[PDB]
Design an enzyme around this catalytic site. Structure first.
Site, mmCIF file in Angstrom:
data_model
loop_
_atom_site.group_PDB
_atom_site.id
_atom_site.type_symbol
_atom_site.label_atom_id
_atom_site.label_comp_id
_atom_site.label_asym_id
_atom_site.label_seq_id
_atom_site.Cartn_x
_atom_site.Cartn_y
_atom_site.Cartn_z
ATOM 1 N N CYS B 106 0.840 -1.209 0.000
ATOM 2 C CA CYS B 106 0.000 0.000 0.000
ATOM 3 C C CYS B 106 0.875 1.259 0.000
ATOM 4 O O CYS B 106 1.571 1.511 -0.988
ATOM 5 C CB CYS B 106 -1.065 -0.039 1.113
ATOM 6 S SG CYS B 106 -2.446 0.992 0.684
ATOM 7 N N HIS B 126 -0.104 1.391 -3.515
ATOM 8 C CA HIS B 126 -1.462 1.846 -3.738
ATOM 9 C C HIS B 126 -1.432 2.906 -4.842
ATOM 10 O O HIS B 126 -0.509 3.744 -4.878
ATOM 11 C CB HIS B 126 -2.064 2.471 -2.477
ATOM 12 C CG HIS B 126 -3.535 2.661 -2.576
ATOM 13 N ND1 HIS B 126 -4.109 3.760 -3.185
ATOM 14 C CD2 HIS B 126 -4.533 1.817 -2.238
ATOM 15 C CE1 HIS B 126 -5.419 3.578 -3.170
ATOM 16 N NE2 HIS B 126 -5.707 2.410 -2.614
#
EC number: 3.1.2.-
Lengths: 188, 188
Positions: B106, B126
């Site tokens: 992420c 992400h």
């Protein structure tokens, strides 16, 4: 309009992924979530040894209802603890009587059987929990990843946790909110 | 042969799903996982307010290495805390120097940039963390759900956590163990 409220009942031996993912996704949806410890206020040792500090004891949280959804995580030993609890029985029967949503994942649905909740519904469980859930033929079994029959919402395993949580969000806050919460998650 | 060991560095504001899912899956694979609190031994308030009790402080856990993998969860504020830590810098540079696996998900990979780790690798993050990661052009960006370039293993978001964790398992314990751990999870 007031925000919806969820009660997540956290017992020793719960599957931590099936606790954390629904809590997190429901909070992303703007639901007020209470993680309530079955045994009290103390930290809970989950099935894979993650230790989670509950927001409240169940004893206290159950006086602050009602809740729009009551959520039962899985894990074989967590579900067995939920199944043995008179407090859980009372909460689930109150929720059913007020026509409120009940959501359970993996082995969690077997606590519905223990407490005689939602008989005559279609349900799913983890494959390994099917025989326990189906003892007596009180439910009809489904292999859908998430199954919803009225106010009984069930799902299968760690890998269905996002689908389960987003189904709760859709039921409480609508399809558009569920879609908006889903997009940043990078789901397959 | 001794069991493999993983260090998961848990900072305030970490994405709890990206902490719990990899810890749980690695423990299912028979990896000895230490959840180490960046700030000390005390409970950690994650991004969506789940509170996790670490196994150890990072200060103590970093003396018990080396580890087969060092894992960096995401969450924007958790990754910022990891990025600011001199202790994290030292651990990651030691891991890189010993040719050990580093895994980040992420926003977590942005701590690799902060600590100058793994430049010249292909990485993913992400989508919202791409620009931060790519500042200076020190990595090549990938949109694969999991990306592995040698000893740098990265992934994108909450919905890639199982894929990320199973890639760690495959790297440490092999494809067969990863497949066996995967089957009971009910992944799509």
């Amino acid at each position: 309009m007031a925000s919806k409220r969820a009660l997540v009942i956290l017992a020793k031996g719960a599957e931590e992924m099936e606790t954390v993912t629904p809590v997190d996704v429901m909070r992303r949806a703007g639901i007020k979530v209470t993680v309530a410890g079955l045994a009290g206020k103390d930290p809970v040792q989950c099935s894979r040894d993650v230790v989670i500090c509950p927001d409240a004891s169940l004893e206290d949280a159950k006086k602050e209802g009602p809740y729009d959804v009551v959520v039962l995580p899985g894990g074989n030993l967590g579900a067995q603890n939920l199944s043995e609890s008179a407090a859980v029985k009372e909460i689930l029967k109150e929720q059913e009587n007020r026509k409120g949503l009940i959501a359970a994942i993996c082995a969690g649905p077997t606590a519905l059987l223990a407490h005689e909740i939602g008989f005559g519904s279609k349900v799913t469980t983890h494959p390994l929990a099917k025989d326990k859930m189906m003892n007596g033929g009180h439910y009809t079994y489904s292999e859908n990843r998430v199954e919803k029959d009225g106010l009984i919402l069930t799902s299968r395993g760690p890998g269905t946790s996002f689908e389960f949580a987003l189904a709760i969000v859709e039921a409480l806050n609508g399809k558009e909110v569920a879609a908006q919460v889903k997009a940043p998650l990078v789901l397959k």
